[PDB]
Design a binder for this molecule. Sequence first.
Ligand SMILES: C=CC1=C(C)[C@@H](Cc2[nH]c(/C=C3N=C(/C=C4\NC(=O)[C@H](C)[C@H]4CC)C(C)=C\3CCC(=O)O)c(CCC(=O)O)c2C)NC1=O
Ligand SMILES: C=CC1=C(C)[C@@H](Cc2[nH]c(/C=C3N=C(/C=C4\NC(=O)[C@H](C)[C@H]4CC)C(C)=C\3CCC(=O)O)c(CCC(=O)O)c2C)NC1=O
Ligand SMILES: C=CC1=C(C)[C@@H](Cc2[nH]c(/C=C3N=C(/C=C4\NC(=O)[C@H](C)[C@H]4CC)C(C)=C\3CCC(=O)O)c(CCC(=O)O)c2C)NC1=O
Ligand SMILES: C=CC1=C(C)[C@@H](Cc2[nH]c(/C=C3N=C(/C=C4\NC(=O)[C@H](C)[C@H]4CC)C(C)=C\3CCC(=O)O)c(CCC(=O)O)c2C)NC1=O
Ligand SMILES: C=CC1=C(C)[C@@H](Cc2[nH]c(/C=C3N=C(/C=C4\NC(=O)[C@H](C)[C@H]4CC)C(C)=C\3CCC(=O)O)c(CCC(=O)O)c2C)NC1=O
Ligand SMILES: C=CC1=C(C)[C@@H](Cc2[nH]c(/C=C3N=C(/C=C4\NC(=O)[C@H](C)[C@H]4CC)C(C)=C\3CCC(=O)O)c(CCC(=O)O)c2C)NC1=O
Ligand SMILES: C=CC1=C(C)[C@@H](Cc2[nH]c(/C=C3N=C(/C=C4\NC(=O)[C@H](C)[C@H]4CC)C(C)=C\3CCC(=O)O)c(CCC(=O)O)c2C)NC1=O
Ligand SMILES: C=CC1=C(C)[C@@H](Cc2[nH]c(/C=C3N=C(/C=C4\NC(=O)[C@H](C)[C@H]4CC)C(C)=C\3CCC(=O)O)c(CCC(=O)O)c2C)NC1=O
Ligand SMILES: C=CC1=C(C)[C@@H](Cc2[nH]c(/C=C3N=C(/C=C4\NC(=O)[C@H](C)[C@H]4CC)C(C)=C\3CCC(=O)O)c(CCC(=O)O)c2C)NC1=O
Ligand SMILES: C=CC1=C(C)[C@@H](Cc2[nH]c(/C=C3N=C(/C=C4\NC(=O)[C@H](C)[C@H]4CC)C(C)=C\3CCC(=O)O)c(CCC(=O)O)c2C)NC1=O
Ligand SMILES: CCC1=C(C)/C(=C/C2=NC(=C\c3[nH]c(/C=C4\NC(=O)[C@H](C)[C@H]4CC)c(C)c3CCC(=O)O)/C(CCC(=O)O)=C2C)NC1=O
Ligand SMILES: CCC1=C(C)/C(=C/C2=NC(=C\c3[nH]c(/C=C4\NC(=O)[C@H](C)[C@H]4CC)c(C)c3CCC(=O)O)/C(CCC(=O)O)=C2C)NC1=O
Ligand SMILES: CCC1=C(C)/C(=C/C2=NC(=C\c3[nH]c(/C=C4\NC(=O)[C@H](C)[C@H]4CC)c(C)c3CCC(=O)O)/C(CCC(=O)O)=C2C)NC1=O
Ligand SMILES: CCC1=C(C)/C(=C/C2=NC(=C\c3[nH]c(/C=C4\NC(=O)[C@H](C)[C@H]4CC)c(C)c3CCC(=O)O)/C(CCC(=O)O)=C2C)NC1=O
Lengths: 162, 172, 172, 172, 177, 177, 44, 324
Amino acid sequence: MKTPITEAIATADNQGRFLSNTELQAVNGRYQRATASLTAAKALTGSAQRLITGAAQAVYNKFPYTTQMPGPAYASSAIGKAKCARDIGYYLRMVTYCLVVGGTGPMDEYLVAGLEEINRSFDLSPSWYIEALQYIKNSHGLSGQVANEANAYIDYAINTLS
Amino acid sequence: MLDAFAKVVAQADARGEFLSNTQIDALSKMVKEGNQRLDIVNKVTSNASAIVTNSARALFAEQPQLIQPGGNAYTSRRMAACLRDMEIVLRYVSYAMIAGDSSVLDDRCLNGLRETYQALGTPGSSVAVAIQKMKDASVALANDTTGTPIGDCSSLVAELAGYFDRAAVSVV
Amino acid sequence: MLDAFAKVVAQADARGEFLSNTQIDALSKMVKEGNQRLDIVNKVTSNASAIVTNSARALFAEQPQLIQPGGNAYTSRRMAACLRDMEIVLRYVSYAMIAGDSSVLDDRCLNGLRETYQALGTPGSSVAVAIQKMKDASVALANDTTGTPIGDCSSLVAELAGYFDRAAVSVV
Amino acid sequence: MLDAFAKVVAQADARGEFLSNTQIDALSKMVKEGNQRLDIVNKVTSNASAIVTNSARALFAEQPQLIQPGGNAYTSRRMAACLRDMEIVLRYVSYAMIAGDSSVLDDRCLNGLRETYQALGTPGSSVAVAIQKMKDASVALANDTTGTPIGDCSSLVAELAGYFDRAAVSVV
Amino acid sequence: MLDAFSRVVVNSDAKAAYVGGSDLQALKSFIADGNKRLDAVNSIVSNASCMVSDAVSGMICENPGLISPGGNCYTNRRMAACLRDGEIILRYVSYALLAGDASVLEDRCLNGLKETYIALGVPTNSSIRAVSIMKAQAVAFITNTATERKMSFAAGDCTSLASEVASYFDRVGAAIS
Amino acid sequence: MLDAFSRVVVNSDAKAAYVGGSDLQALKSFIADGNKRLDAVNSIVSNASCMVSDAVSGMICENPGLISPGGNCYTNRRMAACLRDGEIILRYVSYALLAGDASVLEDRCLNGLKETYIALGVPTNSSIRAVSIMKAQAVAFITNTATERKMSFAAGDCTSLASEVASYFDRVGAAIS
Amino acid sequence: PALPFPVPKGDVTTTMVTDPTTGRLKLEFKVDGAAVSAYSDPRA
Amino acid sequence: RLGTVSGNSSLDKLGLDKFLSESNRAYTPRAQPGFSSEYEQIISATYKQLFGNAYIMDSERAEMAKQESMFRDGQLTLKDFCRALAKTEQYKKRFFDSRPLYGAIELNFKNILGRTPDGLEHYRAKSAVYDTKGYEAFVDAFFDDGEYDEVYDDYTVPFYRGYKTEANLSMAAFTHFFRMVRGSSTSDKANPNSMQKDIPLNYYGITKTPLAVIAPGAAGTAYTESFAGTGSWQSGRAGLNAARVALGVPATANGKSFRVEVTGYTQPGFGITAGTAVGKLYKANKLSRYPRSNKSYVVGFDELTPLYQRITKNGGTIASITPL
Ligand SMILES: C=CC1=C(C)[C@@H](Cc2[nH]c(/C=C3N=C(/C=C4\NC(=O)[C@H](C)[C@H]4CC)C(C)=C\3CCC(=O)O)c(CCC(=O)O)c2C)NC1=O
Ligand SMILES: C=CC1=C(C)[C@@H](Cc2[nH]c(/C=C3N=C(/C=C4\NC(=O)[C@H](C)[C@H]4CC)C(C)=C\3CCC(=O)O)c(CCC(=O)O)c2C)NC1=O
Ligand SMILES: C=CC1=C(C)[C@@H](Cc2[nH]c(/C=C3N=C(/C=C4\NC(=O)[C@H](C)[C@H]4CC)C(C)=C\3CCC(=O)O)c(CCC(=O)O)c2C)NC1=O
Ligand SMILES: C=CC1=C(C)[C@@H](Cc2[nH]c(/C=C3N=C(/C=C4\NC(=O)[C@H](C)[C@H]4CC)C(C)=C\3CCC(=O)O)c(CCC(=O)O)c2C)NC1=O
Ligand SMILES: C=CC1=C(C)[C@@H](Cc2[nH]c(/C=C3N=C(/C=C4\NC(=O)[C@H](C)[C@H]4CC)C(C)=C\3CCC(=O)O)c(CCC(=O)O)c2C)NC1=O
Ligand SMILES: C=CC1=C(C)[C@@H](Cc2[nH]c(/C=C3N=C(/C=C4\NC(=O)[C@H](C)[C@H]4CC)C(C)=C\3CCC(=O)O)c(CCC(=O)O)c2C)NC1=O
Ligand SMILES: C=CC1=C(C)[C@@H](Cc2[nH]c(/C=C3N=C(/C=C4\NC(=O)[C@H](C)[C@H]4CC)C(C)=C\3CCC(=O)O)c(CCC(=O)O)c2C)NC1=O
Ligand SMILES: C=CC1=C(C)[C@@H](Cc2[nH]c(/C=C3N=C(/C=C4\NC(=O)[C@H](C)[C@H]4CC)C(C)=C\3CCC(=O)O)c(CCC(=O)O)c2C)NC1=O
Ligand SMILES: C=CC1=C(C)[C@@H](Cc2[nH]c(/C=C3N=C(/C=C4\NC(=O)[C@H](C)[C@H]4CC)C(C)=C\3CCC(=O)O)c(CCC(=O)O)c2C)NC1=O
Ligand SMILES: C=CC1=C(C)[C@@H](Cc2[nH]c(/C=C3N=C(/C=C4\NC(=O)[C@H](C)[C@H]4CC)C(C)=C\3CCC(=O)O)c(CCC(=O)O)c2C)NC1=O
Ligand SMILES: CCC1=C(C)/C(=C/C2=NC(=C\c3[nH]c(/C=C4\NC(=O)[C@H](C)[C@H]4CC)c(C)c3CCC(=O)O)/C(CCC(=O)O)=C2C)NC1=O
Ligand SMILES: CCC1=C(C)/C(=C/C2=NC(=C\c3[nH]c(/C=C4\NC(=O)[C@H](C)[C@H]4CC)c(C)c3CCC(=O)O)/C(CCC(=O)O)=C2C)NC1=O
Ligand SMILES: CCC1=C(C)/C(=C/C2=NC(=C\c3[nH]c(/C=C4\NC(=O)[C@H](C)[C@H]4CC)c(C)c3CCC(=O)O)/C(CCC(=O)O)=C2C)NC1=O
Ligand SMILES: CCC1=C(C)/C(=C/C2=NC(=C\c3[nH]c(/C=C4\NC(=O)[C@H](C)[C@H]4CC)c(C)c3CCC(=O)O)/C(CCC(=O)O)=C2C)NC1=O
């Protein structure tokens, strides 16, 4: 788990160093943006069921074959649609964990590592999840620097699927 | 290596739910006391050897069989290696002070350190005294009001005393 | 590693003597079935990703408690490491199909596999029920009459079952 | 490692004083054998292949188990494993004889030899006869003054044979 | 301890199903072949004194370095123990075949006899030469092709059963290995 | 349990040696002046607890801070265990003198005393400083060289056995070196 | 197994057959030496 | 002294001479009056046997000065006399209250029964009595069972029995038994694997895993590796212990694999020139080369030779070598 605090510890531990004024501004700058990032995590938490089901329908409007084609990898059934809504809820949960810790720690560990082994095995396309995340990027309805923190960790997830 | 923020995230993911509203303001409490925690480790890194040599000369005056010819920490190749262990645990508690938890502290220092002290034949009750000889000197400068505006920093130095207490238990 | 020819070398090297004539006519029976061995390993490894993903899919259907959050195979790191070990047994069983004995399967893959799983905490009764899906998806794959001419290979499909039940009793 | 001059300094530091003058002329007896140690090395380092051929000539004769089909030293690397192990029990004794103690003998060869034979199944019975077939083979080989003058060397014949029996009891 | 009848229950437990007709078809054919296995193990335990005779007097003629003074079967307690150490391990596989499961062999003896034996000092290659000398001693008796004693059975072919006691005794030898 | 009468019979059974009278002359030298061992044992076991009376008192006069805060013989409980700690090992020294081997101090005492004194933090330098004090304290009753006391002896050279207690005192600091 | 060739005084005459698989034995015309190492002479 | 076939005896040099010399049985149905050097030897035998060679002084023996006198007529030994000694403050100061519940259970088997319980179903039957029916039936759960009424008839003294094949415990209970017994110069407290503040066998007694049975008093028996489980489900770490399994392509690449057990290294010893490099003697990050000692390795048969060199040229002593 990389945080700003568990990264400046690690460069202090590389040099045998007591925590100098170099490593006391890397952890101070997390505190001047933990205000704006924890309101964005609180806002995305409350509007989760609007954003999950709205993005699951915006996938199905762009890619209509996924609701039509038979076989278990598609959203053409009841349980096929339930597992797609589970997956965007897994994706949106790791965005809010990154706004708590201030970096891409929890989606590196719990989401990204080992993801391409799944998407090739179970025949799931990575462009089904760009369209789900590009909905959430410009339909969360945030503004200012609260939107700047949520839009940083959303397109980190787009770049590890692209 | 976890943080205080990453410990409450990792408990949420193993339950599989978002963070509650009672957990965000529990962390919003933790960020507004950040400059108190930045002022604590600025006190115990600006005196990061004046703690240690004054804790060594306190212990060596108290316990005299360390410096005796034939001793455990007698010779000068077992004297800097005594001052190495007195300086890395002041380093690694100060990493655990800035993290908010101590899972950096036990895995990078204290996992089996009393088993390596068993193999060297080191008296481990006196090094636990030396952590306690370092513990009160660390809180005497954390409570020092010079140069900072005055407020209440009560439970943060009881957290800092708990990190030294966790170090001093598992070395005997 | 040892195959069937390497058995009676080491089964007579400590005995000391030469190869007796009453054993090798059973071993020249084995080369009559040498062409019915290599189609059959070609039947397994051509479908080597359709026996894995069709049986992990039928594993999480009947056991939803592994893909639920807080489960063993929950995250994407531990889903990829569940499909890794489901294919590892498919290699070392088909290695034992081409060789004539078990002794590369239970020396490189089953020697401590359940005690790997007791230390990690995976359900060792539940890896056996994924393997027994892969047993039934491969024995019923290796009885097709397309690609080969027909004829009784009923002796050689019991050996393919007999290593799939050897991994079914290794992991519990 | 430490040597025969070092232990009376190891008891001069761990006790902690200066030198007694009875500790100085005890080292005169070390150089009363000091030239007489040096030609004793010539009776064992010039006959390195000569003892380890003449001993393992004898050792399979009264004990024909090692050359049996199903015996220990059967393959030629195992028979070469005997010759790399017969000499080092004499080589580190030849390191111990120029040292005057058994510190480097215990440091680099002996500590880790009973259990290493037991994990491999090589017997503790017959690795002591490889001490004993070279024990009498160097009592005769070092007791002759061919090149050096004649006097008293009745101490050091009870020191290199004071080291083979140390290796005998440290393996059985 | 596991039974083969117990083996389908924990198979049907994490699966959370009932018992169907599908996995039931293995066990109902196990009933009618139960008497044939019951005609096997009675002759394993009744010629057991011969099987522990040829366990230890047979392995000692192919390495006699243990009766040598200094060996690992020299004294008459270790002579007595090697007669005793082999007559328990075939008593355990007589339990193991009636359940059918090797886990009763594993938890009782085969979890940790290897870690004792290098602290008890005995060699393991001598042991597996004494394990495998009971292996072909066993499989003669189940088939009735033994030379000096021929016993009463019925007529058939228990070579599926005769591989199973050979499927035990290699894992007896691999545990010490 | 070994003694010098039976040290040879675990030596000669590597040889299977029926003991003709060449090697037995050291045992006939052991029965020759074993009275000087016997006249030293009564000079030890009657003067036994005054060896340990100045052992730790001789230790604490030059190593003073073990009765200090953070010592090892601080309390009455910390000190009285140390006086039984030294009196156990000098009880086990003189078992080996009348036996004749180094058996009893290894197969009971130093089959695990190195991990004992580092489980408690017993300082190994001060727990040989007392035994080096108890080295020369234990030679003076055999020598009759003492400043304070004379034992009624007969006048010969027991210097073969006056350093044999020091040749037991060396391998008590084998593991706790 | 095959007759061993026309024996000259050669004391080793390689056993024959032997048992349930088996074979091999060095014969010195009746006596069967076979690796006891009679040349056992250390020089002390 | 070390030896397996040294004088035909395998376990007298393992540390069980006096636990196999004595039998400690009493011969009269009541203790006769008049003579006080024949039955006080039985009491100080049991004061080291039941307490595990712990120091009972006379300052606490006279605190317990009733419970031996009622044995002299009125109690039986082993069933009632050490049962009364197990209900004392001195028994509750060492084996009940400085340590957890399982550590109080798993030290009581060495004290009372002379064995080690295997798995947790033997810990299940003993700890179903404390949480329901107190401490006095918890101690008397042992004394009225088949495990106690068969091995000792009621006028012997309870010995150690966790090494024989008639004590049908397990094969793993052998391997725990020399973690618990370190010669005849230890205690519950003077034991490095657990002091009085700790628990002996937390993982290994539960999971029935066997261990390296090290002979005590050997060269470098000052070793025990610590514990951290690995994996991401249990959120553990990596780098503390070598594995107990040795599977894979490096299983049978170099032959048969082994597990070695190193006692410990220092800073003088790494160079091949017999000294210390005079300088700063460290790196910049101020750790050792082996930054914690008592480490272990997994290695095949074809690299046992340079690894045995590389331990022994560097100052490391070897506990044992077990094959995997
Ligand atoms: C009307 C009278 C009056 C005063 C004189 C102050 C007196 C005073 N100073 C400090 C405490 C302090 N006051 C300052 C502030 C400063 N120190 C400096 O070096 C600068 C010149 C200055 C502006 C940065 C600091 C930094 C401390 C804490 C450090 C210290 O005690 O030296 C405190 C404790 C908490 C507090 O700040 O209230 C008090 C009561 N208060 C009063 O009511
Ligand atoms: C980059 C490095 C860095 C630092 C070194 C500190 C320095 C620092 N501390 C404080 C601010 C403070 N510092 C303290 C702490 C203390 N006051 C005491 O008298 C106690 C001795 C001590 C408790 C541990 C408190 C209590 C405040 C807030 C003042 C107040 O209570 O009103 C402030 C004002 C703004 C802020 O709160 O951040 C600054 C810049 N902060 C940093 O960002
Ligand atoms: C490099 C890869 C490779 C292979 C896999 C085999 C494939 C193979 N099999 C057969 C030939 C055959 N193969 C089968 C086999 C089978 N019929 C069944 O019902 C079973 C499903 C299956 C066994 C697994 C039979 C029954 C024959 C004809 C009988 C015979 O071989 O004489 C032949 C024709 C030559 C011959 O008759 O031997 C070939 C080339 N050979 C190869 O070179
Ligand atoms: C520089 C390298 C070097 C050597 C190679 C040896 C060789 C050697 N030894 C001796 C000298 C000696 N060498 C011996 C040795 C022996 N006599 C015996 O009866 C034994 C059988 C035999 C041992 C194997 C004795 C006893 C002396 C002393 C002569 C005497 O006693 O008068 C001398 C004469 C100088 C001296 O006395 O030190 C030399 C050069 N010594 C060395 O310093
Ligand atoms: C080295 C010295 C030496 C011996 C001690 C005997 C012992 C002996 N018996 C057999 C071999 C055997 N031993 C038995 C056992 C028995 N037969 C019966 O019917 C009895 C009831 C029972 C008690 C005697 C059986 C059944 C076989 C297999 C041969 C057969 O009968 O078919 C084998 C071969 C097994 C092997 O090594 O693979 C040996 C070595 N023969 C020797 O060469
Ligand atoms: C599950 C079954 C089962 C066992 C096997 C034993 C396991 C076992 N075997 C021995 C002990 C032994 N076992 C053997 C036997 C052998 N050693 C060899 O060299 C041969 C390979 C082999 C004979 C075939 C010998 C020789 C001893 C030594 C007895 C001794 O050391 O005194 C001991 C020590 C007994 C003691 O110390 O009291 C134990 C616990 N117990 C059991 O419950
Ligand atoms: C009171 C004690 C008691 C027993 C001893 C067994 C006795 C027993 N054996 C078999 C019966 C049998 N047993 C065998 C077994 C064998 N035949 C062979 O050719 C091999 C040598 C050997 C093992 C492979 C076979 C082939 C049958 C006949 C098939 C069957 O009906 O089971 C049967 C069923 C038929 C019958 O009634 O005879 C019974 C009851 N059961 C008992 O209750
Ligand atoms: C700092 C304080 C201090 C002490 C307490 C003493 C402790 C002490 N006692 C002895 C040495 C001894 N102690 C005894 C013991 C006794 N003599 C008897 O005859 C009695 C029966 C019995 C109790 C009085 C004996 C016999 C010796 C050896 C010779 C002697 O001093 O008499 C030695 C010498 C051991 C050595 O050489 O290492 C020392 C250091 N000395 C000190 O400097
Ligand atoms: C049950 C109790 C009991 C005993 C202990 C022995 C007592 C005993 N001690 C010695 C005898 C002796 N003791 C000594 C010893 C010494 N003289 C010195 O001045 C030295 C300081 C010291 C040497 C260490 C000597 C030299 C003899 C005479 C030689 C001999 O041992 O026979 C003798 C032989 C003298 C004789 O024949 O009368 C006897 C019987 N016997 C017993 O029945
Ligand atoms: C048969 C072999 C055998 C032994 C050798 C002893 C070994 C032994 N020593 C101690 C225990 C001890 N031994 C010492 C002794 C010393 N520490 C020092 O610094 C001094 C130099 C030295 C005195 C000479 C101390 C201080 C303790 C610890 C007592 C405590 O912890 O309070 C204990 C723990 C007992 C307990 O506290 O319950 C044991 C078993 N007992 C035996 O059964
Ligand atoms: C937290 C990190 C994490 C990720 C990312 C993850 C993905 C994941 N998605 C899966 C399935 C699935 N995912 C989908 C999703 C979709 N298919 C569609 O048609 C839609 C377009 C799309 C939804 C946007 C479907 C239908 C399945 C079922 C595939 C099958 O049953 O074979 C499966 C197979 C197991 C199952 O859920 O049944 C995994 C492991 N698991 C994880 O633990
Ligand atoms: C050489 C051949 C080989 C074998 C035999 C092997 C076993 C093995 N399986 C492992 C983990 C694992 N194995 C599984 C698999 C499962 N758990 C479940 O609950 C399911 C029932 C099942 C999947 C269907 C899981 C979830 C892990 C944990 C991964 C981790 O913790 O990172 C690990 C720990 C390392 C890792 O893969 O992360 C090993 C060593 N590994 C090998 O490389
Ligand atoms: C650093 C110095 C050093 C020591 C102390 C050492 C011991 C040592 N001896 C070994 C093997 C061996 N040692 C022997 C020797 C014998 N077995 C017998 O039965 C005979 C009585 C005896 C003498 C002929 C044999 C046969 C092996 C191979 C074991 C096997 O392959 O089964 C091995 C295993 C690797 C190898 O084959 O070399 C080690 C590590 N190796 C070293 O490099
Ligand atoms: C990864 C971080 C880390 C850990 C966990 C660690 C343990 C550690 N402490 C050591 C030594 C030591 N530690 C001490 C410390 C003391 N002895 C006393 O008497 C005092 C009570 C106490 C401190 C004042 C001494 C004297 C040595 C040297 C012992 C020797 O060299 O034999 C050594 C031997 C190598 C060295 O010189 O550093 C290790 C590995 N070292 C590390 O770098």
